[PDB]
Amino acid sequence: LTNLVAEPFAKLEQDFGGSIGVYAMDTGSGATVSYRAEERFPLCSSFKGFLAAAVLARSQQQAGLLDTPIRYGKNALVPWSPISEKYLTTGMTVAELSAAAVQYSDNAAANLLLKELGGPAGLTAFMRSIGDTTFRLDRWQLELNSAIPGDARDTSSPRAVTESLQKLTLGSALAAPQRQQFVDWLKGNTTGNHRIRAAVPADWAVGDKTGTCGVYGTANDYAVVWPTGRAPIVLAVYTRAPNKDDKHSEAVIAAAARLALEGLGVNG
Numbered sequence: 218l219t220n221l222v223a224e225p226f227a228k229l230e231q232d233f234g235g236s237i238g239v240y241a242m243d244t245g246s247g248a249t250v251s252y253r254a255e256e257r258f259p260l261c262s263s264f265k266g267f268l269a270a271a272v273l274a275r276s277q278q279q280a281g282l283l284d285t286p287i288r289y290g291k292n293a294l295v296p297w298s299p300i301s302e303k304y305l306t307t308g309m310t311v312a313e314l315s316a317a318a319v320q321y322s323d324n325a326a327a328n329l330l331l332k333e334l335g336g337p338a339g340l341t342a343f344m345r346s347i348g349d350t351t352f353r354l355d356r357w358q359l360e361l362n363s364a365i366p367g368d369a370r371d372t373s374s375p376r377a378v379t380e381s382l383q384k385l386t387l388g389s390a391l392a393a394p395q396r397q398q399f400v401d402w403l404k405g406n407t408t409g410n411h412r413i414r415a416a417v418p419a420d421w422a423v424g425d426k427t428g429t430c431g432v433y434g435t436a437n438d439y440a441v442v443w444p445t446g447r448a449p450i451v452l453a454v455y456t457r458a459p460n461k462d463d464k465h466s467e468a469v470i471a472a473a474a475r476l477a478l479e480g481l482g483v484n485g
Protein backbone atom coordinates (compact mmCIF):
# COMPACT_ATOMS: atom_id res chain seq x y z
CA LEU A 218 0.00 0.00 0.00
CA THR A 219 3.00 2.35 -0.34
CA ASN A 220 3.07 4.77 -3.28
CA LEU A 221 0.15 3.19 -5.13
CA VAL A 222 0.05 6.44 -7.15
CA ALA A 223 3.30 8.15 -8.17
CA GLU A 224 3.67 11.92 -7.68
CA PRO A 225 6.27 14.39 -9.11
CA PHE A 226 8.24 15.01 -5.95
CA ALA A 227 11.56 14.87 -7.85
CA LYS A 228 10.61 17.78 -10.14
CA LEU A 229 9.42 19.78 -7.12
CA GLU A 230 12.70 19.36 -5.21
CA GLN A 231 14.75 20.11 -8.34
CA ASP A 232 12.88 23.39 -8.86
CA PHE A 233 13.47 24.15 -5.15
CA GLY A 234 17.18 23.37 -5.48
CA GLY A 235 17.46 20.87 -2.64
CA SER A 236 15.90 17.80 -1.04
CA ILE A 237 12.31 17.20 0.12
CA GLY A 238 11.28 14.38 2.47
CA VAL A 239 7.64 13.32 2.81
CA TYR A 240 5.77 10.59 4.69
CA ALA A 241 1.97 10.58 4.82
CA MET A 242 -0.31 7.94 6.35
CA ASP A 243 -4.03 7.30 5.82
CA THR A 244 -4.96 5.94 9.26
CA GLY A 245 -8.08 4.23 7.91
CA SER A 246 -6.62 1.94 5.26
CA GLY A 247 -2.94 2.12 6.17
CA ALA A 248 -1.95 3.41 2.73
CA THR A 249 1.12 5.64 2.63
CA VAL A 250 2.97 8.13 0.44
CA SER A 251 6.76 8.06 0.90
CA TYR A 252 9.58 10.11 -0.67
CA ARG A 253 13.06 10.23 0.95
CA ALA A 254 11.07 9.16 4.01
CA GLU A 255 13.94 7.46 5.88
CA GLU A 256 16.55 10.17 5.25
CA ARG A 257 17.54 12.38 8.17
CA PHE A 258 16.57 16.07 8.11
CA PRO A 259 17.16 18.76 10.77
CA LEU A 260 14.28 19.12 13.21
CA CYS A 261 14.81 22.86 13.77
CA SER A 262 11.99 24.18 16.00
CA SER A 263 9.75 21.16 15.17
CA PHE A 264 11.19 19.38 18.21
CA LYS A 265 9.01 21.64 20.40
CA GLY A 266 5.84 19.71 19.55
CA PHE A 267 7.35 16.47 20.86
CA LEU A 268 8.65 18.46 23.87
CA ALA A 269 5.07 19.45 24.77
CA ALA A 270 3.95 15.83 24.40
CA ALA A 271 6.72 14.75 26.79
CA VAL A 272 5.52 17.33 29.36
CA LEU A 273 1.99 15.98 29.03
CA ALA A 274 3.25 12.43 29.56
CA ARG A 275 5.00 13.48 32.77
CA SER A 276 1.81 15.23 33.91
CA GLN A 277 0.05 11.84 33.96
CA GLN A 278 2.20 10.97 37.00
CA GLN A 279 2.33 14.55 38.40
CA ALA A 280 -1.17 15.98 38.76
CA GLY A 281 0.12 19.43 39.66
CA LEU A 282 2.72 19.83 36.92
CA LEU A 283 0.75 21.76 34.30
CA ASP A 284 -0.39 24.48 36.73
CA THR A 285 3.07 24.94 38.29
CA PRO A 286 4.19 28.61 38.02
CA ILE A 287 7.64 29.13 36.47
CA ARG A 288 9.54 32.40 36.98
CA TYR A 289 12.54 33.31 34.83
CA GLY A 290 15.10 36.06 34.40
CA LYS A 291 15.89 38.33 31.48
CA ASN A 292 18.82 36.02 30.63
CA ALA A 293 16.24 33.40 29.60
CA LEU A 294 14.85 35.61 26.81
CA VAL A 295 16.63 34.63 23.60
CA PRO A 296 15.65 35.85 20.11
CA TRP A 297 12.10 34.90 19.04
CA SER A 298 10.34 34.59 22.41
CA PRO A 299 7.14 36.46 21.52
CA ILE A 300 4.92 35.18 24.37
CA SER A 301 7.39 34.66 27.24
CA GLU A 302 8.76 38.19 26.82
CA LYS A 303 5.30 39.56 27.80
CA TYR A 304 5.34 37.59 31.10
CA LEU A 305 8.97 38.19 32.15
CA THR A 306 7.82 40.18 35.18
CA THR A 307 5.12 37.69 36.22
CA GLY A 308 6.10 34.14 35.24
CA MET A 309 4.03 31.59 33.31
CA THR A 310 2.66 28.12 34.09
CA VAL A 311 4.13 24.94 32.61
CA ALA A 312 1.00 24.56 30.49
CA GLU A 313 1.29 28.14 29.25
CA LEU A 314 4.98 27.64 28.37
CA SER A 315 4.03 24.44 26.50
CA ALA A 316 1.29 26.22 24.54
CA ALA A 317 3.67 29.06 23.63
CA ALA A 318 6.38 26.64 22.50
CA VAL A 319 3.89 24.82 20.22
CA GLN A 320 1.77 27.73 18.96
CA TYR A 321 4.34 30.54 18.61
CA SER A 322 7.58 28.47 18.52
CA ASP A 323 8.62 30.47 21.60
CA ASN A 324 12.33 29.83 22.20
CA ALA A 325 12.63 30.86 25.86
CA ALA A 326 9.58 28.73 26.72
CA ALA A 327 11.05 25.69 24.95
CA ASN A 328 14.40 26.10 26.74
CA LEU A 329 12.74 26.24 30.17
CA LEU A 330 10.72 23.09 29.44
CA LEU A 331 13.76 21.26 28.04
CA LYS A 332 15.49 21.95 31.36
CA GLU A 333 12.55 20.47 33.26
CA LEU A 334 12.76 17.24 31.23
CA GLY A 335 16.50 16.71 31.66
CA GLY A 336 17.77 18.31 28.47
CA PRO A 337 18.17 16.87 24.96
CA ALA A 338 18.84 13.38 26.34
CA GLY A 339 15.62 13.51 28.37
CA LEU A 340 13.49 14.36 25.34
CA THR A 341 15.27 11.67 23.32
CA ALA A 342 14.53 9.17 26.11
CA PHE A 343 10.82 10.04 25.94
CA MET A 344 10.82 9.41 22.19
CA ARG A 345 12.54 6.04 22.78
CA SER A 346 9.77 5.22 25.31
CA ILE A 347 7.08 5.47 22.59
CA GLY A 348 9.15 3.28 20.23
CA ASP A 349 10.89 5.94 18.10
CA THR A 350 14.47 4.80 17.51
CA THR A 351 15.34 7.50 14.92
CA PHE A 352 14.71 10.82 16.71
CA ARG A 353 17.70 12.46 18.35
CA LEU A 354 18.00 15.80 20.12
CA ASP A 355 21.63 16.54 21.01
CA ARG A 356 22.06 20.27 21.64
CA TRP A 357 20.35 23.14 23.38
CA GLN A 358 18.79 25.90 21.40
CA LEU A 359 20.21 28.07 18.64
CA GLU A 360 23.15 25.78 17.85
CA LEU A 361 20.72 22.86 17.42
CA ASN A 362 19.46 24.71 14.28
CA SER A 363 22.84 24.74 12.45
CA ALA A 364 21.51 22.23 9.84
CA ILE A 365 25.04 21.24 8.76
CA PRO A 366 25.01 18.89 5.72
CA GLY A 367 25.65 15.30 6.82
CA ASP A 368 25.36 16.07 10.57
CA ALA A 369 22.98 13.63 12.30
CA ARG A 370 22.69 15.72 15.48
CA ASP A 371 19.22 17.16 16.10
CA THR A 372 17.57 15.24 13.27
CA SER A 373 14.85 12.72 12.57
CA SER A 374 13.23 11.21 9.47
CA PRO A 375 9.85 12.18 7.98
CA ARG A 376 8.66 8.62 8.58
CA ALA A 377 9.61 8.53 12.28
CA VAL A 378 8.09 11.99 12.82
CA THR A 379 4.79 10.85 11.31
CA GLU A 380 4.75 7.53 13.18
CA SER A 381 5.41 9.25 16.52
CA LEU A 382 2.87 11.98 15.79
CA GLN A 383 0.24 9.31 15.09
CA LYS A 384 0.99 7.51 18.36
CA LEU A 385 0.67 10.73 20.40
CA THR A 386 -2.40 12.31 18.75
CA LEU A 387 -4.46 9.24 17.75
CA GLY A 388 -2.85 6.20 19.40
CA SER A 389 -2.30 5.19 23.01
CA ALA A 390 1.02 6.86 23.87
CA LEU A 391 -0.78 9.50 25.96
CA ALA A 392 -3.82 9.09 28.20
CA ALA A 393 -7.03 10.39 26.67
CA PRO A 394 -7.16 13.81 28.42
CA GLN A 395 -3.50 14.50 27.62
CA ARG A 396 -3.97 13.29 24.04
CA GLN A 397 -6.77 15.81 23.41
CA GLN A 398 -4.74 18.60 25.04
CA PHE A 399 -1.84 17.86 22.67
CA VAL A 400 -4.27 17.94 19.72
CA ASP A 401 -5.77 21.22 20.96
CA TRP A 402 -2.35 22.88 21.21
CA LEU A 403 -1.48 21.75 17.66
CA LYS A 404 -4.84 22.98 16.35
CA GLY A 405 -4.05 26.41 17.83
CA ASN A 406 -0.70 26.82 16.10
CA THR A 407 -0.25 30.30 14.55
CA THR A 408 2.97 29.78 12.49
CA GLY A 409 1.85 27.30 9.82
CA ASN A 410 -0.75 29.08 7.69
CA HIS A 411 1.46 28.93 4.55
CA ARG A 412 2.61 25.29 4.91
CA ILE A 413 0.52 22.09 5.28
CA ARG A 414 -2.57 24.15 6.20
CA ALA A 415 -2.43 25.93 2.83
CA ALA A 416 -3.10 22.53 1.19
CA VAL A 417 -6.01 21.63 3.52
CA PRO A 418 -9.58 22.83 2.86
CA ALA A 419 -10.94 25.33 5.36
CA ASP A 420 -13.77 23.01 6.50
CA TRP A 421 -11.35 20.30 7.76
CA ALA A 422 -9.73 20.30 11.19
CA VAL A 423 -5.93 20.42 11.33
CA GLY A 424 -3.12 20.80 13.84
CA ASP A 425 0.58 21.27 13.07
CA LYS A 426 4.06 22.29 14.24
CA THR A 427 6.61 24.11 12.04
CA GLY A 428 10.39 24.41 11.93
CA THR A 429 12.62 27.01 10.22
CA CYS A 430 16.38 26.69 10.86
CA GLY A 431 17.38 29.86 8.93
CA VAL A 432 20.21 28.26 6.93
CA TYR A 433 20.71 25.55 4.29
CA GLY A 434 17.18 25.95 2.88
CA THR A 435 16.02 23.95 5.89
CA ALA A 436 12.38 24.15 7.03
CA ASN A 437 9.55 21.75 7.82
CA ASP A 438 6.02 21.07 9.09
CA TYR A 439 4.13 18.07 10.47
CA ALA A 440 0.39 17.78 10.92
CA VAL A 441 -2.66 15.71 11.73
CA VAL A 442 -5.57 16.39 9.38
CA TRP A 443 -9.24 15.38 9.83
CA PRO A 444 -10.99 15.35 6.43
CA THR A 445 -14.73 15.12 6.93
CA GLY A 446 -16.31 11.71 6.47
CA ARG A 447 -13.13 9.59 6.57
CA ALA A 448 -10.24 8.66 8.83
CA PRO A 449 -7.54 11.20 9.74
CA ILE A 450 -4.28 11.66 7.83
CA VAL A 451 -0.89 12.15 9.52
CA LEU A 452 1.99 13.65 7.52
CA ALA A 453 5.45 15.22 7.69
CA VAL A 454 7.23 17.46 5.14
CA TYR A 455 10.94 18.31 5.66
CA THR A 456 13.36 20.21 3.41
CA ARG A 457 17.06 21.02 3.17
CA ALA A 458 19.48 22.34 0.55
CA PRO A 459 23.24 22.18 -0.09
CA ASN A 460 24.45 25.78 0.41
CA LYS A 461 24.35 27.67 3.70
CA ASP A 462 22.65 30.70 2.13
CA ASP A 463 20.02 28.74 0.15
CA LYS A 464 16.58 30.05 1.09
CA HIS A 465 13.76 27.93 2.45
CA SER A 466 10.33 27.96 0.80
CA GLU A 467 6.91 27.76 2.43
CA ALA A 468 5.32 27.29 -1.01
CA VAL A 469 7.37 24.13 -1.61
CA ILE A 470 6.15 22.66 1.69
CA ALA A 471 2.51 23.38 0.80
CA ALA A 472 3.00 21.92 -2.68
CA ALA A 473 4.53 18.75 -1.24
CA ALA A 474 1.57 18.40 1.14
CA ARG A 475 -0.83 18.74 -1.80
CA LEU A 476 1.00 15.98 -3.70
CA ALA A 477 0.85 13.73 -0.61
CA LEU A 478 -2.93 14.15 -0.25
CA GLU A 479 -3.36 13.51 -3.98
CA GLY A 480 -1.25 10.36 -3.71
CA LEU A 481 -3.53 9.09 -0.92
CA GLY A 482 -6.66 9.80 -2.99
CA VAL A 483 -7.97 12.35 -0.50
CA ASN A 484 -10.15 14.82 -2.39
CA GLY A 485 -9.20 18.34 -1.36
Ligand SMILES: *C(=O)[C@H]([C@@H](C)O)[C@H]1C[C@@H](SCC/N=C\N)C(C(=O)O)=N1
Nearest residue numbers: 261262297322362408427428429430
Ligand atom coordinates in the same frame (compact mmCIF):
# COMPACT_ATOMS: atom_id res chain seq x y z
C1 LIG B 1 12.62 27.26 14.93
O1 LIG B 1 12.65 26.58 13.91
C2 LIG B 1 12.86 28.74 14.95
C3 LIG B 1 13.96 29.00 16.01
C4 LIG B 1 15.33 28.48 15.53
O2 LIG B 1 14.04 30.38 16.25
C5 LIG B 1 11.55 29.47 15.24
C6 LIG B 1 11.38 30.89 14.62
C7 LIG B 1 10.13 30.80 13.70
S1 LIG B 1 10.51 31.25 11.92
C8 LIG B 1 11.79 32.57 11.77
C9 LIG B 1 11.32 33.78 12.58
N1 LIG B 1 11.55 35.07 11.88
C10 LIG B 1 12.81 35.51 11.43
N2 LIG B 1 13.85 34.75 11.63
C11 LIG B 1 9.81 29.33 13.83
C12 LIG B 1 8.55 28.77 13.24
O3 LIG B 1 7.61 29.57 13.06
O4 LIG B 1 8.64 27.54 13.03
N3 LIG B 1 10.42 28.67 14.72
